[PDB]
């Protein structure tokens, strides 16, 4: 209920600060790639009969 937070701005600001800190921690450790693992996986068996 917004009335809880209107009379208690500090606790609303604390929630936002927690979210901001968590996101700033997450961004550095997120992998970066053009596309996710979209292609079907493949397993290859290689045999030799010289």
Partner 1 sequence: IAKLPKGIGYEWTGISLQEKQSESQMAFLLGLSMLVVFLVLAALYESWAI
Ligand X SMILES: CCCCCCCCCCCCCCCCCCCC(=O)O[C@H](COC(=O)CCCCCCCCCCCCCC)COP(=O)(O)OCCN
Residues of the shown chain interacting with partner 1 in the complex, contacts defined by CB under 8 A: 8, 10-11, 14, 17-18, 21, 25
Site for ligand X in 20-49 (CB under 6 A): 22, 25-26, 29
- 3-42 burial, b for 16+ CB within 10 Å, e for fewer? eeeeeeeeeeeeeeeeeeeeeeeeeeeeeeeeeeeeeeee
CB nearer ligand X, residue 24 or residue 45: 24
Choice from 5, 12, 18, 20 touching ligand X (CB under 6 A): 18
CA distance 31 to 18: 22
CB nearer partner 1, residue 10 or residue 33: 10
């Amino acid at each position: 209920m917004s009335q809880f937070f209107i009379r208690r701005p500090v606790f609303a600001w604390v929630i936002a600060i927690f979210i901001i800190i968590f996101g700033l921690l997450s961004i550095p450790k997120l992998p970066i790639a053009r596309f996710p693992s979209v292609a079907p996986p493949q397993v290859n068996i290689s045999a030799t009969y010289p």
